[PDB]
Amino acid sequence: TQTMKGLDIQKVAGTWYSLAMAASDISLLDAQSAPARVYVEELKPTPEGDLEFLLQKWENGECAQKKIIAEKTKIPAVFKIDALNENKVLVLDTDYKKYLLFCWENSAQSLACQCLVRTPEVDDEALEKFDKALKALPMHIRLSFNPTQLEEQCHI
């Protein structure tokens, strides 16, 4: 999986909306509570060059929040979220101002990718770049959300 060259995380800070999602396996995304059914609400880079994700997910009939710190690695658009180097964040592309494409990757191979946007509207260009970036990847499910869902907790 190829990641962005020359990513500056200082330019990704702020609130985001998970516009579309895709995964290598149906059961990662299909259920409301599926393991990869996670909604990115905010990105916060640290001075150290780590990337904090503020996430929402449906559990046990309620929307829950979690902060995940993705730690910098030797590769500038690749972050680790465990000590065992099993789970990674891969940033594929961003124009900073409108959209950001990234994947969760687990190499115990599971892949769940998202198209994030800065404003809670459909961006056809962002969706097109998302689809193009996914062309090389073995995705078996894709989901996209309407503007109304983008503004509700857990995209209800």
Ligand X SMILES: CNCCCN1c2ccccc2CCc2ccccc21
Can residue 89 be called a binding residue for its own copies (CB under 8 A)?
Answer: no
Which listed option, ligand X, its own copies, Cl ion, none, makes contact with residue 13 (CB within 5 to 8 Å by class)? none
How far is the C-alpha of 66 from the C-alpha of 124, rounded, in Å?
29
Which listed option, Cl ion, its own copies, ligand X, none, makes contact with residue 133 (CB within 5 to 8 Å by class)? none
How far is the C-alpha of 43 from the C-alpha of 89, rounded, in Å?
13
The phi, psi pair for 116, rounded to 5°, reads: -100, 145
Q: To the nearest whole angstrom, how small is the minimum distance from the Cβ of residue 149 to ligand X?
A: 12
Specify whether the CB–CB gap between 91 and 77 falls below 8 A. Answer: yes
Q: What is the binding site for ligand X (CB under 6 A)?
A: 20, 22, 28, 35-36, 38, 55-57, 59, 64-66, 68, 81, 87, 104-106, 110-112, 127, 130-131, 134, 138-144
